[PDB]
Amino acid sequence: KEKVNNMVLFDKGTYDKLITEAPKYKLITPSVLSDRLRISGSLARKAIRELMAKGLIRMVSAHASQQIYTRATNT
Amino acid sequence: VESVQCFGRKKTAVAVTHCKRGRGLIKINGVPIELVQPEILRYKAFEPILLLGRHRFAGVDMRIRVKGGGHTSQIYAIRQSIAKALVAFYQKYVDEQQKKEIKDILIRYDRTLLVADPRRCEPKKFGGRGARSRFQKSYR
Amino acid sequence: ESVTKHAIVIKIMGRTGSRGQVTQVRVKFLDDQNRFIMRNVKGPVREGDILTLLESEREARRLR
Amino acid sequence: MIHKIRITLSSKNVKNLEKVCADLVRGAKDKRLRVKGPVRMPTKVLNITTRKSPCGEGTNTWDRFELRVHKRVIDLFSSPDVVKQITSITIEPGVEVEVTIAES
Amino acid sequence: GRVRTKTVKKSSRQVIERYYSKMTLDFHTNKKILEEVAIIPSKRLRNKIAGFSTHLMKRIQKGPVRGISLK
Amino acid sequence: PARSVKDVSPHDFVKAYAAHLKRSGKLELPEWTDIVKTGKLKELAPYDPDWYYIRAASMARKIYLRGGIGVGGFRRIYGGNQRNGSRPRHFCKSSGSVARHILQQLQTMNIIDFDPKGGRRITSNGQRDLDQVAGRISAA
Amino acid sequence: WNAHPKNYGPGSRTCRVCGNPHAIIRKYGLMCCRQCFRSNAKEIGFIKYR
Amino acid sequence: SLVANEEFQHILRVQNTNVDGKQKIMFALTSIKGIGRRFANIACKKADIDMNKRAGELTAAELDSLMVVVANPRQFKIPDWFLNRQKDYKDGKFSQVTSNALDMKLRDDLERLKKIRNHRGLRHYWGLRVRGQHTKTTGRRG
Amino acid sequence: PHTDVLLFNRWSYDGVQIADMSVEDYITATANKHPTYMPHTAGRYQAKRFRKAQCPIVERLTNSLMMHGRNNGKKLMAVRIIKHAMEIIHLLTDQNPIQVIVDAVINSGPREDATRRQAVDISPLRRVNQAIYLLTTGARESAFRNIKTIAECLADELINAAKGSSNSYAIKKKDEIERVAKANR
RNA sequence: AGGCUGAUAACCUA
RNA sequence: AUUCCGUUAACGAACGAGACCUCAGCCUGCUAACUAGCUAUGCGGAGGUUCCCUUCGCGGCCAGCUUCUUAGAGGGACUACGGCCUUUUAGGCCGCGGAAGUUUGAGGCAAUAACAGGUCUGUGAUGCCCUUAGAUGUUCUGGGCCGCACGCGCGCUACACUGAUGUAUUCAACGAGCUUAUAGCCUUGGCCGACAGGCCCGGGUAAUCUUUGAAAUUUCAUCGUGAUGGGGAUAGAUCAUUGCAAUUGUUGGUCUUCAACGAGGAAUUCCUAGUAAGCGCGAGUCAUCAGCUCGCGUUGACUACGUCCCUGCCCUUUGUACACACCG
Ligand SMILES: [K+]
Ligand SMILES: [K+]
Ligand SMILES: [K+]
Ligand SMILES: [K+]
Ligand SMILES: [K+]
Ligand SMILES: [K+]
Ligand SMILES: [K+]
Ligand SMILES: [Mg+2]
Ligand SMILES: [Mg+2]
Ligand SMILES: [Mg+2]
Ligand SMILES: [Mg+2]
Ligand SMILES: [Mg+2]
Ligand SMILES: [Mg+2]
Ligand SMILES: [Mg+2]
Ligand SMILES: [Mg+2]
Ligand SMILES: [Mg+2]
Ligand SMILES: [Mg+2]
Ligand SMILES: [Mg+2]
Ligand SMILES: [Mg+2]
Ligand SMILES: [Zn+2]
C-alpha cells in the first residue's frame, strides 16, 4: 500500500488542466477532482468554488457531507 | 364554530390537529408546515397534502400541536393527525360521499395515515441489557 | 450444452436437506407446459413463483 | 360564608379509596353543596428490586416489588363545620383522610 | 394453537343441554345469554365458551353430536 | 405575506440577526472571547471568529420564543455529550460566563429584561427588532 | 472508646431488623437489609405483579 | 484555488523540530513538544496570523512572531491557567516550556522525587504505574 | 399506467419496467405496485412470510445501508445516501435512476448455488435478497478508508451492476457463486 | 501458551 | 401443552398446563378535574395591510368543554366471518373487516420426586465443637483487602470520511427529592469565575417546585486517506470540591505529554420486530466515587417463517452382564 501524495496547492500545470478539463466532466465532486488531479480534498473544495464563481460549472445538489456539481453546458 | 380536533399517535408521540373553517393555513406549533424538520422527513408530513391536493385544504385552517416521542415519531403522529382531521371535518361539515372519496385515497396509499401503529417498546428483563439480548455466556 | 429455461412452481413437495435448508418442488416449463420435473430450491419459495434453470436436464430424486 | 375546602384521600386499596370517595361526594350531594372532584392524581408506584438469593450463588434472579399509592382530591364549597360533619363518618381501613382549607 | 380445554368444552355442552331453546347461532347474542344463565368468573373465559357453544349450535343444526343429549 | 421569526428558517435568521448585532456595534465583547471554549465538554475553541455574535443571536431568538430562561437553562441548552476517554459519554453543561455575559449585554440593548417570575423575558423593542430582521430575509 | 466518627458510611447504618450492616435498602427510609426486606416485603405492603 | 509560488516551503525548522509545510499553520505547530491544538490556536490569534493558510505559505518573519508569543505568553495577555508550567517548583514563575526545555523539566521532576526517595519517585524508578491503577491484569508488556 | 407519485418528488415511476419473469413479482418499483414518495416507511414487513417482497426496492436498499454496528438505526443518513446516489446516477447515465436500480438488482442476483455440496436453484425472493446484499456490500467496502464518498461508491456500483460490467463487486461475486455451483453439478 | 473436553489422552491454533 | 378428538378393562377424580393476576395496545362513548389541558372570548405586545389577518403573553372557581393529560367503572377478540384442507371430529392454512387474528405482546405465579448444589459471613434461625479477660469478645491507631514476570472470564473505548471537530438546530420515558438548625435532600433564579466552583434571594415533603426537563440524529463549515484534527492509554505541572483524614493519584477542571490499535488465529456468545444493534436518561450502591446492575425511553434493521446435521430435551418399541446407573 503506497501513500498518496496529493498537492495542497495548485501548480501552473495542474491549474490550467482544471480550467480546461474539469468543466467537461459530467460529475464534479471534491473526491472526483481529488483523484483525477491528485489534489487534496481541501484544495478541491476551494477549486469548486472558483469554478462556480467563473460560471464554468452548475450546482446539482448541496449538502455538508456530499456536494454534487456538473458542467454548466452539456457537451 | 365548525372545528374538529383529531389526534395521531406513534410510539409516545401525540399530535393533535385543530382543523377549522378557514383559508388553507397549516402550521405546527406556530411554524408553517413547509419548514418541518428534519428536511428529509418533510416528504412524509406532506403526503396527505400531496395525495389529496392543496385544493382540498383550501377551505380549512389546521393548527397542529405535538408532544412527546422523537424526531421521527412526531412526523408520523403529525402525518396521521392531519389525515384524520380532514376526514373528520369532511364527514361532519362537508358531506359523507366526499369523506368516502378522500378516505379511500388515503387508505390505498398507506393504512397508517388513519390507523395508529400499536407497536411499543418491550420491557427489559434481567439477565441481559435488552428485552431479548442476554448476557454473554462463558463456560471456562 | 446448457440452455436457460423458466419454469413455474406447481407444488411444494417438502423441505429437504440435512438442516432443512432446501425445498423440493415440482416445476412446469413455460416454453413447453407438458413437461414436469423435480428441482431443489434454496431460499423461500411458494407455489406460483417462477424459477430460472441454468440447466434443465437434471432432475432431483424424490426425498433427496 | 362559603369557602372552597380541599379533602385529600390516599390509600393502597383502590376499592376502599373509591368507596370512601363515593360516600363523600354522595354525602355532599344530599346537602346540595357544590362538589369538584374526585380528582385522581397519577398513581405513585414505589419500586424495590432485590436479589432473591440470600447469598450470591446461582442464576441472578430478581424480585420486583411494587407498592402502589392512589391519591384522590375532592373540593367542597361549604363552611368548615359542614365539611367536618360529612367527613366525621367512619372511614374504611387503610384510607387516610386529610382536610385542609384551600389557600386558593 | 387454539384448542379449547376441558373447562371450555365441558361448560359449553352443559349450557346447550339445558338451554338449547335459548341458544342461537349468533356469538354476540349467545355471550349475553351465558351471563344470564351462568356465572363465568372471567370475561375471556365467557367469550371462549360463547364462541365454542355457537360452534356446537352449528354442529347440531346439520346433525347430532356426541357429548350433547337433547331430550 | 408578513414573515416573523417563526415564519423563517432558524438557520437563516441566526445568520441574518448575528450580522445585525455586529453591525450595530452595541455589544461589548469580553477580553476572553478569543481564549475560552463554550464549555468543558468542548475540545477546542469555536472556529467562527464571530461566534459571540452568533451565540447572542441564537439566545435572543430562544428568549423570543420562550420567556423565563435563566443562565442555568442556557447552559443545558448549549450543552451536550462530553467524551471521557475510555469511559462512556454523558451530558455536560456549557459555560455560564458566556451565557451570563451575553444576557447582560442584550439587556443593556433593551432586547430582553428580567421576568418577574425569574429568568429573562423579551421586551417590546426586542420583539420589533427580531421581527424586522426576519421580514428582510429573502425568501428561500 | 467509639471515638471514631460514625456520621456517614456503612459503619453508621445498620439493618433495623437484624442489625447487619450489609446490603441496606435506604430507599424510602426502609433501612432494612435486602434479606430482611424480602422476608417482610409482603407484611410491609410490597407485592409482586410482574 | 490559488497557485503555489516559489516561496512555498515543504519543510520548516522550528525549535529543532521538523514542521510540515503542507499542514495548516494551527496544526503544523503541534509537532513542537509543549504546544498543543489549544495553545497553537491562541498563539496564531495573538500573532495576527491567518489560520486558513498552510504553514509553508508563511514568511520567515511571520513564523518567528509565533515563537515570540510562545516565549512570552504573559506579554500577550495569555492567562496563567492556560500554561503547561504553572507556579514552577524552583522559580515559581508561569511559562510555556517546549522542545528540550519540556524534556528537561520532566527529568528534573522525576530526579527530585527519586532523590528524596518519594514513593511516586520510587515507582518511576521501578517502571511501575504511579497514579493508583491496578497492576494485576493490565500493563503487561514484559 | 400513470401515477402522480414521484420518488423524492424528483423521479417518476412511469416507464419503469422489470424485464425479468422470475423476479418481477418480488421487486416493487413500478407505478402500479404502490409507488412511494419517500423510501422511509415504518412498515411491518416481517409479520409474515414473503411479506417483505411488497416493500419498495429502493427502501430495501436503504435498510441494507445501516451497517455495520456503528450505523445501525441511522436510517435518515441512509435515505440521504440513496437520494444523493440517484442524483449521481442520473448525471452519469442520463437515465431514470429507478430503472437503473432495478437493472442492477436483476443482474446482480445469483441464479444457482451449492448446498450440503451439490448445485441447487435459488428462489426469486432470495435472489433479490442476495442482489441487495451484494450491491451494498461492494459500496461499503469501496468507501471504507477511501476519499470517495459512500454515495459516489454506491452510484458506481449500481451503474456497473446495471450495465452488467465485471467491474462491479456484486457482478464478480455473482459469477463466483454460480461458478462454484456449476462445478458441483 | 491458548483453544476444544466435565476432566485426561488425541486433535487444532499461535 | 398428559392440549383436545377418539380408541378402550377400565370407570371417576387430584396437581401441573390452561384459566388466572400485572403492564402495554383500541374507546372523539361513561364518570370529571384552578396540582392536567384544549377551544373560544377579553385585554396587551410585535409584524402585515381603523376593520381584518398572523403570532405571542396575561386574565376570567359565572366562556364552554374533556379531543389531547390523568384514572376509575365498563366495552372490545370468540378465530367471530369467508374459502380451502382434515374423519361426522379435534383442529390447521389463507383472506376481508378490525386497534388488535402468534394462547394479541411482555411478565408474575408455577406440580411430583430430587441435588450431600449455595448460604452457619443476612438474622436475638440453630445443634454440637472451639475460644471467653497475656479473649477468636469489643473498641482505638496504622497498614492490607488495590500489592505484579504471568493465565482466564464479564465489559468499556477504538482502529475513522456511513467519520472527528466547530457551529446552527431540535424531539423522550421510567423515576427520585429535605431535620430547616443561617443550612444536612432535589434544586430554579440573580451575581462572581475561562473552567472547576463559590455567594445571595427563594420553590418543593411534591401531576403544584427542580422538570421551561437528553443523546444519537438534523444542519452548515473545516479537516482530506497521512496513525491524520482517527485513538486517548501513559506521564508532568497546577486549581477546586467531598471528608476527621485523599499519600498507594477519591473524584472533578486547565495546559502539556500523545502508547498499542489499520477490523483481529483456533475457537466461541446472544438474538426472530419496535426485536438486534446504536443513543442517551433515571434508580440501586452513595459524604465523595460507575466502565456494574435494575428499569426507561429515542433511532431502528438483515435473515428465517425451517430442520434434527451439531448441542440438548420429551414420548414409543427394542437390547443390556449397567442400578454409585456409560464419568457404568
Ligand atoms: K445542545
Ligand atoms: K502490570
Ligand atoms: K392581537
Ligand atoms: K443462613
Ligand atoms: K453454627
Ligand atoms: K445483610
Ligand atoms: K490523556
Ligand atoms: Mg505539540
Ligand atoms: Mg489503586
Ligand atoms: Mg378523553
Ligand atoms: Mg378493561
Ligand atoms: Mg416443575
Ligand atoms: Mg456441598
Ligand atoms: Mg477485593
Ligand atoms: Mg454478568
Ligand atoms: Mg480526537
Ligand atoms: Mg422536551
Ligand atoms: Mg494523533
Ligand atoms: Mg456490583
Ligand atoms: Zn436485616
Side-chain angles (χ1 to χ4, degrees):
Chain A
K1 172 54 63 60
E2 179 60 16
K3 291 185 176 183
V4 184
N5 188 19
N6 292 326
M7 64 186 67
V8 167
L9 291 169
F10 283 107
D11 60 359
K12 183 179 179 181
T14 305
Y15 181 83
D16 299 329
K17 191 180 187 64
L18 176 73
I19 301 299
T20 57
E21 303 297 346
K24 288 185 173 181
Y25 298 168
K26 275 188 172 183
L27 178 64
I28 301 173
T29 64
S31 61
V32 169
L33 296 177
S34 180
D35 294 327
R36 292 201 182 188
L37 302 178
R38 203 186 90 268
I39 61 178
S40 62
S42 179
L43 181 59
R45 279 187 280 97
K46 307 199 211 70
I48 288 171
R49 288 201 295 268
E50 181 178 8
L51 298 175
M52 285 291 294
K54 292 188 175 184
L56 299 174
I57 64 179
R58 68 181 190 85
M59 192 197 74
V60 180
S61 178
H63 200 281
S65 301
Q66 177 63 11
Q67 303 79 23
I68 302 169
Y69 293 84
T70 184
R71 60 196 176 187
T73 55
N74 305 329
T75 305
Chain B
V1 182
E2 303 177 354
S3 63
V4 298
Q5 285 181 122
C6 298
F7 64 86
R9 294 185 185 274
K10 175 61 183 300
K11 298 182 180 177
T12 61
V14 186
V16 182
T17 297
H18 173 59
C19 180
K20 67 191 298 186
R21 187 75 67 179
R23 67 207 88 265
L25 177 145
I26 304 179
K27 293 182 175 177
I28 299 162
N29 293 327
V31 180
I33 192 172
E34 286 70 4
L35 301 176
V36 165
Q37 303 289 48
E39 300 185 342
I40 206 172
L41 287 179
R42 186 176 298 170
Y43 306 102
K44 299 299 298 185
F46 259 90
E47 281 174 354
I49 303 175
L50 295 171
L51 295 169
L52 303 178
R54 269 287 183 176
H55 58 89
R56 301 271 188 174
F57 300 80
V60 298
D61 283 1
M62 291 185 175
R63 291 176 174 81
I64 309 177
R65 61 188 188 276
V66 62
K67 187 174 184 177
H71 295 145
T72 298
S73 63
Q74 281 195 352
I75 297 299
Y76 278 89
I78 295 168
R79 176 177 176 265
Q80 177 177 310
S81 65
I82 294 170
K84 289 174 64 179
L86 193 73
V87 173
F89 189 91
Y90 271 64
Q91 184 185 21
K92 186 176 179 185
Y93 299 110
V94 180
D95 188 70
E96 187 65 17
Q97 296 189 313
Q98 297 191 21
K99 182 232 181 181
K100 176 65 175 182
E101 182 180 359
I102 64 181
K103 192 172 186 179
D104 293 334
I105 295 170
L106 300 171
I107 291 294
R108 284 190 173 187
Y109 178 88
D110 182 11
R111 186 167 182 269
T112 60
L113 286 171
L114 300 175
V115 182
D117 195 324
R119 292 181 292 176
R120 295 295 191 277
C121 290
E122 184 178 334
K124 175 189 176 298
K125 275 76 72 175
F126 61 84
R129 291 186 176 179
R132 305 292 177 85
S133 176
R134 303 291 78 185
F135 290 133
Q136 185 175 53
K137 189 178 185 181
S138 59
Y139 298 94
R140 301 180 182 85
Chain C
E1 301 181 2
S2 300
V3 182
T4 300
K5 297 270 184 173
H6 289 84
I8 185 173
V9 177
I10 300 299
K11 53 157 60 180
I12 305 301
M13 308 306 298
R15 304 295 292 270
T16 177
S18 56
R19 291 136 160 185
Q21 75 290 354
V22 177
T23 307
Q24 182 172 124
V25 300
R26 182 176 173 87
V27 302
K28 183 188 72 176
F29 287 89
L30 300 178
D31 57 325
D32 185 2
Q33 298 185 354
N34 295 330
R35 181 185 176 184
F36 298 82
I37 57 175
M38 298 295 179
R39 305 289 295 188
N40 289 331
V41 180
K42 181 181 179 181
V45 66
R46 58 182 175 185
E47 177 179 352
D49 58 7
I50 300 170
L51 295 165
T52 302
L53 311 179
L54 277 56
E55 74 298 1
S56 55
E57 308 303 339
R58 294 193 310 165
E59 186 175 13
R61 300 180 180 178
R62 193 185 180 182
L63 302 184
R64 216 177 190 180
Chain D
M1 185 181 298
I2 189 175
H3 305 72
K4 169 164 165 288
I5 306 302
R6 185 184 303 276
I7 302 175
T8 299
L9 308 189
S10 300
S11 182
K12 299 157 58 182
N13 189 336
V14 179
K15 281 197 173 185
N16 292 21
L17 186 60
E18 294 294 338
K19 178 180 175 181
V20 177
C21 294
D23 298 358
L24 296 178
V25 175
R26 172 254 297 175
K29 294 289 180 59
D30 298 358
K31 297 185 180 181
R32 303 160 187 172
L33 304 176
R34 183 186 176 188
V35 182
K36 264 189 173 182
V39 189
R40 319 184 202 276
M41 303 292 93
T43 306
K44 305 179 187 301
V45 182
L46 289 66
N47 57 98
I48 296 289
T49 304
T50 181
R51 181 76 176 279
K52 303 196 193 190
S53 182
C55 58
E57 186 277 340
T59 306
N60 299 16
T61 56
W62 299 80
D63 268 322
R64 185 164 180 270
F65 283 105
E66 291 182 346
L67 194 165
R68 300 171 182 174
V69 181
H70 304 263
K71 185 176 181 178
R72 302 288 180 276
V73 185
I74 298 171
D75 297 325
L76 300 179
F77 298 82
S78 59
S79 61
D81 298 328
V82 178
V83 177
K84 172 179 172 182
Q85 183 176 104
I86 296 173
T87 61
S88 181
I89 62 180
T90 58
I91 306 300
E92 294 294 348
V95 182
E96 193 280 343
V97 184
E98 189 175 4
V99 180
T100 64
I101 302 174
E103 302 183 6
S104 303
Chain E
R2 297 176 182 269
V3 189
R4 292 83 163 188
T5 55
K6 284 164 184 176
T7 301
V8 178
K9 289 197 175 69
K10 186 172 184 176
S11 300
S12 302
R13 299 187 187 95
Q14 295 179 12
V15 171
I16 295 171
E17 283 173 4
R18 66 197 68 179
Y19 291 109
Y20 177 81
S21 58
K22 256 180 168 57
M23 296 298 293
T24 60
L25 297 172
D26 177 67
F27 159 83
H28 299 283
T29 305
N30 290 15
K31 70 178 187 179
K32 304 299 181 183
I33 295 170
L34 296 181
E35 301 172 354
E36 206 71 358
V37 309
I39 297 172
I40 307 178
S42 65
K43 183 198 297 181
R44 198 156 76 90
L45 180 59
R46 177 250 293 171
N47 289 329
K48 292 172 176 295
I49 294 172
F52 186 75
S53 64
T54 303
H55 170 76
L56 290 176
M57 293 295 294
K58 296 169 62 176
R59 287 277 302 282
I60 296 167
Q61 289 291 358
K62 302 201 178 188
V65 300
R66 193 66 164 273
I68 312 185
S69 60
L70 299 175
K71 309 305 181 183
Chain F
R3 289 191 175 184
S4 299
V5 177
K6 285 175 170 293
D7 302 0
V8 300
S9 177
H11 302 302
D12 297 359
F13 178 83
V14 172
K15 296 178 179 177
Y17 193 69
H20 183 82
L21 294 174
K22 184 184 179 185
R23 190 184 309 163
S24 65
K26 297 175 179 177
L27 294 175
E28 303 179 8
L29 274 58
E31 303 175 353
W32 43 254
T33 298
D34 291 69
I35 305 176
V36 303
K37 309 178 293 183
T38 58
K40 69 184 181 64
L41 74 168
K42 305 294 181 179
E43 297 184 4
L44 303 176
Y47 297 171
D48 189 76
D50 298 326
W51 68 270
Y52 186 88
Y53 300 104
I54 298 171
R55 177 57 59 85
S58 175
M59 292 177 63
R61 179 180 170 278
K62 294 185 181 298
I63 298 171
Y64 170 95
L65 297 171
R66 187 206 304 168
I69 308 177
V71 175
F74 283 108
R75 294 182 64 195
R76 184 192 67 261
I77 285 170
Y78 299 108
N81 256 5
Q82 180 185 19
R83 300 182 66 179
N84 302 275
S86 296
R87 295 170 62 183
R89 309 182 186 185
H90 296 280
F91 178 85
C92 174
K93 299 174 183 177
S94 63
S95 177
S97 290
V98 175
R100 190 175 70 268
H101 191 279
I102 284 172
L103 292 174
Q104 293 177 353
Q105 293 297 320
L106 295 174
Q107 189 162 354
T108 54
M109 298 176 63
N110 304 275
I111 296 168
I112 63 189
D113 65 327
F114 286 139
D115 202 19
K117 298 174 181 176
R120 260 73 175 188
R121 180 177 57 183
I122 194 76
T123 63
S124 298
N125 177 82
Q127 289 176 311
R128 177 180 302 94
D129 190 59
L130 293 164
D131 288 357
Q132 286 179 337
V133 173
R136 285 187 286 270
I137 297 172
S138 62
Chain G
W1 191 266
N2 288 115
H4 188 63
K6 301 187 71 175
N7 309 122
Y8 57 80
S12 60
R13 296 175 296 275
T14 58
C15 177
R16 68 197 306 172
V17 185
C18 70
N20 191 260
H22 297 277
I24 307 305
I25 299 177
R26 301 167 63 184
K27 202 179 189 185
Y28 314 117
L30 283 165
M31 299 305 301
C32 302
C33 75
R34 66 181 186 85
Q35 290 85 355
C36 289
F37 169 83
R38 218 180 64 88
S39 177
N40 299 273
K42 183 181 180 181
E43 200 164 22
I44 293 168
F46 282 85
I47 301 173
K48 289 163 54 53
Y49 300 98
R50 57 174 177 81
Chain H
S1 63
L2 289 173
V3 179
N5 59 334
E6 285 67 6
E7 297 183 354
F8 184 83
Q9 306 180 13
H10 293 269
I11 307 176
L12 298 74
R13 287 285 294 182
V14 181
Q15 291 189 356
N16 308 329
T17 61
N18 296 19
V19 176
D20 186 4
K22 296 171 63 271
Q23 304 295 340
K24 300 289 287 298
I25 183 59
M26 168 175 168
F27 297 84
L29 301 172
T30 56
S31 60
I32 300 165
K33 275 199 178 186
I35 296 173
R37 295 186 295 176
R38 276 284 285 166
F39 201 96
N41 179 265
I42 194 179
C44 299
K45 293 176 178 174
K46 295 296 188 300
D48 301 327
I49 288 176
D50 185 7
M51 284 183 291
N52 198 20
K53 55 166 62 177
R54 304 291 171 163
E57 287 182 329
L58 278 67
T59 64
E62 295 177 358
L63 187 69
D64 301 330
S65 59
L66 283 164
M67 312 316 302
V68 179
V69 176
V70 179
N72 305 271
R74 170 145 47 259
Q75 182 176 5
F76 292 83
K77 305 186 180 183
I78 297 176
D80 289 356
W81 54 265
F82 201 85
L83 304 177
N84 65 4
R85 194 73 183 183
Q86 309 174 24
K87 183 171 164 179
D88 185 71
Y89 181 90
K90 304 184 182 183
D91 307 330
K93 298 183 178 183
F94 301 77
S95 60
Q96 189 75 2
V97 304
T98 59
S99 298
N100 295 272
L102 179 60
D103 295 328
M104 292 172 59
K105 249 67 176 183
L106 182 59
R107 179 180 176 182
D108 296 331
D109 292 328
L110 303 184
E111 286 292 356
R112 162 176 156 273
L113 298 178
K114 187 193 176 186
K115 171 175 165 181
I116 59 178
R117 293 193 60 82
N118 184 262
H119 176 260
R120 182 153 63 93
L122 291 173
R123 294 191 68 87
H124 278 286
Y125 175 69
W126 301 334
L128 305 171
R129 298 290 169 81
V130 309
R131 293 190 170 184
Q133 307 94 330
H134 296 177
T135 61
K136 181 176 181 177
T137 56
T138 57
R140 298 181 183 177
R141 311 179 192 181
Chain I
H2 171 78
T3 182
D4 294 325
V5 180
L6 280 63
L7 185 63
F8 296 116
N9 287 269
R10 179 62 176 86
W11 316 113
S12 178
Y13 292 90
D14 301 359
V16 179
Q17 64 185 23
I18 300 163
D20 194 330
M21 303 176 63
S22 180
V23 294
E24 181 172 356
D25 296 326
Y26 291 93
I27 297 171
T28 301
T30 54
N32 60 93
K33 284 204 295 180
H34 292 264
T36 181
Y37 285 98
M38 186 183 181
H40 186 294
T41 66
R44 305 181 294 271
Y45 296 103
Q46 305 303 341
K48 198 166 190 175
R49 198 188 186 193
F50 297 104
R51 191 159 175 171
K52 63 188 179 185
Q54 301 173 355
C55 182
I57 191 68
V58 180
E59 184 172 359
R60 298 200 68 187
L61 276 169
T62 308
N63 293 326
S64 51
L65 289 175
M66 294 190 296
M67 305 179 183
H68 301 287
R70 60 172 179 175
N71 301 319
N72 292 150
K74 299 181 179 183
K75 190 162 185 174
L76 295 181
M77 180 167 61
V79 176
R80 182 198 68 195
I81 294 167
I82 281 180
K83 181 176 178 295
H84 294 337
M86 296 183 72
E87 295 170 352
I88 296 168
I89 291 167
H90 183 55
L91 295 174
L92 295 171
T93 61
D94 301 329
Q95 296 174 352
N96 189 331
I98 302 177
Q99 186 64 75
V100 176
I101 290 169
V102 297
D103 295 330
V105 172
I106 294 169
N107 296 331
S108 59
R111 306 184 304 278
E112 197 179 22
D113 192 4
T115 186
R116 290 176 285 178
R117 260 187 162 184
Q118 66 181 59
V120 296
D121 298 324
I122 302 179
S123 62
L125 178 52
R126 177 171 177 84
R127 177 181 170 186
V128 175
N129 296 12
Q130 292 295 112
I132 296 167
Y133 163 84
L134 292 173
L135 290 170
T136 54
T137 300
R140 185 178 300 98
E141 289 179 356
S142 56
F144 189 66
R145 298 188 72 184
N146 186 17
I147 187 70
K148 196 172 176 183
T149 61
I150 182 60
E152 298 165 10
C153 296
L154 182 60
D156 284 329
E157 178 60 17
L158 293 170
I159 291 165
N160 293 332
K163 197 179 186 181
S165 178
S166 62
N167 295 14
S168 176
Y169 169 93
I171 297 295
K172 282 173 172 174
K173 291 289 172 177
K174 169 174 174 177
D175 299 331
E176 182 181 353
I177 291 168
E178 296 184 2
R179 192 218 71 182
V180 174
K182 184 179 179 182
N184 292 269
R185 287 177 177 176

